[PDB]
Every structure is written in C-alpha cells, then in structure tokens.
Ligand binder design. Structure first.
Ligand SMILES: CCC[C@@H](C(=O)Nc1cnccc1C)c1cccc(Cl)c1
Ligand SMILES: CCC[C@@H](C(=O)Nc1cnccc1C)c1cccc(Cl)c1
Lengths: 304, 304
C-alpha cells in the first residue's frame, strides 16, 4: 500500500551520460553505441541564441571542436551531423554500458522519468507527464540541456525526451531523440506561446482508481454519468474530453475495483463541481494527472 | 526553474540489489563488499510472523539455506549472523559494483530516496521523509522488504533505511542498516501504534523559500512574527516547534532571497490560519514538508 510519484530506476541511463563542450558552451550528451546525442545549441554563443543560423554555425565547427567527456575519459570524435535540433557525434568507441534501447516519440498525456544532469553528471531523477500542450513542468537549471526523459520495460530503455529549453513562463520544452521538438517550439531565445493546457482526464481517473485501491474512498458517490454529460463538465473545467479509447485503457482498473468507468467519472464530476472540501486524496489536495492507467497498474502490482 | 520531488540517481544502489530466499520466503538483500544485508524475517513462515522467536528460528538455519542471487548469478554463503533486526550473510565474493558507502541513522524530518525492489529487481525510485513519528509514507507491496533508503554525496552512498513492514494503518516501518528500528516498532505481525505525527516545520519553510525562488510569491505578506508567537500557531496546527537551530539551517535560503526567517514564519502562520484560498504553491494545494533546507539549496543550485 501507499502511492508515490515513482520514477524508473535511472541506472541504465546514468551510464550513458557524457559532457559535451563546443567553444565556451558545455551541456549533456547521451552516449549510445558509438554515437553521442546532444542539443544542437551546444555550438551557439550568447549572441547566437537570439536568432541562430545553425547550418552556418555548424560549418565553422570540426570533429576536434566537440569535446566529449564520459566521467573522466575523453572520447575521440570521428564524425558530426545535425538531425533536426540534435547533433550526433560519431565516436571511435561504443559505450560499454549501452543498455537495450529504443527511440520513441511519446504522445501528450504520457509519462516518463527525467534524469537531470549537469556537466555530464546525474543530479536527480523525477517523474513527469508530457502536458497536452507539449511542454513539461520539470526542474532544470542552466546546463541541464541534454538531460533525457525515458521509460523502461524489462531491460529496454525507451528514450523519449531531450531537454532543450526553458520558456519565459518557466515551463520546459525539448525534442524526441531524432531532434524533433514536441509542440511548436523552436531552439531560439525568443518569446514562444505554449498552447492552452488541459488536465489529462484519463490520468486523473487512473489516479482515482489508485486512491480506491489504497483506501482513500471518501470521494465515491451514489451517482453515475454518461460520456456526453461528463464531457460537458470536462469542457467547463478545461479537462481533456474522455473517449471510448480512454475508457478501454481504464478497463483493468475498473475490473480490479469493480467500479464502472462511468461511475468513477461521476465521482470526478462531483469533485470538479464541489472541490475537495479541505480533504486529501493520496496525500494531495488537488486532482493529480501525472499517473497514467499503465503507471497505476505497474505500481499497484509490483512490475520490476 | 521548476521544483520537483527529486530522488537521487539510483544507479549505485541498483548494482547492490540481490534476492534472498530462505525456505518459502523471498525478499531483497543489499550486497556491499562480501556481505549481504536483509530483514531477518526472511527466515519466518506465515505462522511465525505473529510472535517469532528469531533466535530459535535462525538456529534451525544453515549457510546453505540462504539462497542469494544477484541478477542471474548465485552467491556462495560462507557465514550468517543476526544483528538486531537484520541478517548479515557473509558471501565468498565481494560485490564488484560496491560504491563508496556509509551506514547512517537519519534523524526524523530528514529526507532520503527509496529504491523499491521486488525479487532483487529495482522497480522504481521515489523521495520521501522520515516522519517525526519514525514512520515513512512509502509505496511498498508484499516482497518489497529489504528495499533501501539512501542519500548520495558526490560518490558516497549513505544507506539510512531498510524496509521491513507495513503497519495496519498502511504506513511503513523499517530499520537503519545495523537493524535498529526507527521508532518503537517490532518485526512482529501485531497491531502497533505509531506516535502522533507532526508536520516538519523547517521543511515547509524551506519549501516556501523554494517557491519564492521559482516565482510563486502570492503568500508573502506585510507581517512578521517571533519564535514564541509562531510556536503557539505551530502547536495549534500540530507543526513541529521551530528552534534557533532550524532558523540557522534556513540561513542560506534567507540570505539568497533576502526574506528574514521570521518574516517567512509570518507567511506560514497566515497560511496555517487562512488556508490557501483555492490557490497553489509549486503545484501543490497543501503545505509540503518533504523538502529539507539542504534539498532546496541542492536542487536550486545544481549539485550533482
Ligand atoms: C542562453 C541559453 C539558454 C537556454 C536555456 O533555456 N537553458 C535552460 C534550460 N532549462 C532551464 C534553465 C535554462 C537557463 C536556451 C534558450 C533558448 C532556446 C534554447 Cl534551445 C536554449
Ligand atoms: C506476512 C509478512 C508481511 C510483512 C509485511 O508487512 N510486508 C509488507 C511490507 N510492505 C508492504 C506490504 C507488505 C505486505 C511483515 C509483517 C509484519 C512484520 C514484519 Cl517485520 C513484516
């Protein structure tokens, strides 16, 4: 029993972190096989970041300009190339600690763990969600660029995020490992609007099931609703509309607790319309949306 | 910017996790040098747990009865001994992945990361606090016994906790790595009262400073208070009394933000007396006490 914002064990990712330096800028790199991946803005100076011409900046660079250091050893760079917003530095040595891995592009509302790094050294690990507007609410300081987000299934690390920047609003933006930004963001020091965010409804419902499993049941009521009625409330409170696909993914949690998905929607509707009345659910005084149905089943069963 | 419930990178601890089996029971072990540490209740059967005579149960056991498996390799047990509530199984092979380490006994109100494990395999990592009543509010299922709590300074892992049990209330109890329980708990399947818990005042103040650093400032007010006046409010709301030692540890955060500790106490007093009025602080709708002043400075500066 108990329910925590649990991150994946970061060990397999810690063994991939390196430091990349180009000129005066130092950030983090991900060493997988004989390739080091990092944000392409490692080639920029302060003056460049306002409106960088990355193709032109990279032309002034050579393999010997990218200094890559894994712990205390120096990697020999034999090639460099830009793919979207990431740089791929081919090195002469495959990382011996390379775990089984995949590069995935997650969907908004999905979760992942972030291993925050500075100077190629891991500082901490936390779990978070890719917001519906493609931003993440992380904890990153200058030099955290290149830190990555990932999920782990058995022995396979699926890398899904690489940190690139902090928006003037204090929220974070980044790319998939092919260097494609999530959302409309560009790697430029310019004001950039993030979309209107919404609360991930399927995740709040999953967390409500996790609460029932762990004993917090005060929010259960004598009511039910329909997808259409629930969605009218979801609209009013800027929640994502619930679809049959979301209902389907909640199937196992509904089966385990015997609480029909639409009956749980009616508890959520009442919580949206009345608030929590000074009470808590799983130690939170608000509706939590950073746990997917998969996360809840994993944590509630003991998946290693 | 941003503020997260960050756990230490778990890599150094993952390389120490093993599975220990004795008879029908399987739990987690911590392999450091040539010793494997685990909860002594690994020797118990279901009938034993109600009132176990551990000295007598261990006498029926031999080195060959403790099966210790690190991943897929089998460790040869050359000695066994009970120290308080832990068993120390001497093995013929030192763990090659043994990091620099210490065994520490943390104080109530201090924080640490937990690497939840099952069958010797890591499942997740989360940060938590040792409650003032010596319980922890973790996330543990059957088989998580033997999982450990730790802190990391540079390259040194200080192990501070080993999980032993879940109280009927759903809260967790465990020992230091010398097998001494935190609190009055005994490793028996019996109803056990945990003390009246209190909120860790120094930690809430530290988190209020973290909020100001990251932009959440709505709670700052035109007031101040004294240690005596603040403690009268702390008493009413079951908060730990604030001492000059707590004020002293908040010194750096007070210096960084220029907000005197007693002025921050007056914001906390107003929040205790008025609630949050439907607002949030660092994404929380309640007063967070699982971040120490050290944690806040570490996260806010970038300590790796
Ligand atoms: C002058 C470089 C700043 C860097 C940047 O946001 N880093 C950063 C990241 N996370 C937290 C804090 C910080 C300061 C950046 C700005 C604009 C666009 C891009 Cl691609 C990068
Ligand atoms: C019948 C063994 C149960 C075990 C126990 O609480 N495990 C456990 C731990 N964390 C979460 C869930 C669980 C089921 C235990 C009970 C009483 C005392 C002791 Cl020392 C151990």
């Amino acid at each position: 029993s108990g329910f925590r914002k649990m991150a994946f064990p970061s060990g397999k990712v810690e063994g991939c972190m390196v430091q990349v330096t180009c000129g005066t800028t130092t950030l983090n790199g991900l060493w997988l096989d004989d390739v080091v991946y990092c944000p392409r803005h490692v080639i920029c100076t302060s003056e460049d970041m306002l409106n960088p011409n990355y193709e032109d900046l990279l032309i002034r660079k050579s393999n010997h300009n990218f200094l890559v250091q894994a712990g205390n050893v120096q990697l020999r760079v034999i090639g460099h190339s830009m793919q979207n917003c990431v740089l791929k530095l081919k090195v002469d040595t495959a990382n011996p600690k390379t775990p089984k891995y995949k590069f995935v592009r997650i969907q908004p509302g999905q979760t992942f763990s972030v291993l925050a790094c500075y100077n190629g050294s891991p500082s901490g690990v936390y779990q978070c969600a890719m917001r519906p507007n493609f931003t993440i609410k992380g904890s990153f300081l200058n030099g955290s660029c290149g830190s990555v987000g990932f999920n782990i299934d058995y022995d396979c690390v699926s890398f899904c995020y690489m940190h690139h920047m902090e928006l003037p609003t204090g929220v974070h933006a980044g790319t998939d490992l092919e260097g494609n930004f999530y959302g409309p963001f560009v790697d430029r020091q310019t004001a950039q609007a993030a979309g209107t965010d919404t609360t991930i409804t399927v995740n709040v419902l999953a967390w409500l099931y996790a609460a029932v499993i762990n004993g917090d049941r005060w929010f259960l009521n004598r009511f039910t609703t329909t997808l259409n009625d629930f969605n009218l409330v979801a609209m009013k409170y800027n929640y994502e509309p619930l679809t049959q696909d979301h209902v389907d993914i909640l199937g196992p949690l509904s089966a385990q607790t015997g609480i029909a998905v639409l009956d749980m929607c009616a508890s959520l509707k009442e919580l949206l319309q009345n608030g929590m009345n000074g009470r808590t659910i799983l130690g939170s005084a608000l509706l939590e949306d950073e746990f997917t149905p998969f996360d809840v089943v994993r944590q509630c069963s003991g998946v290693t």
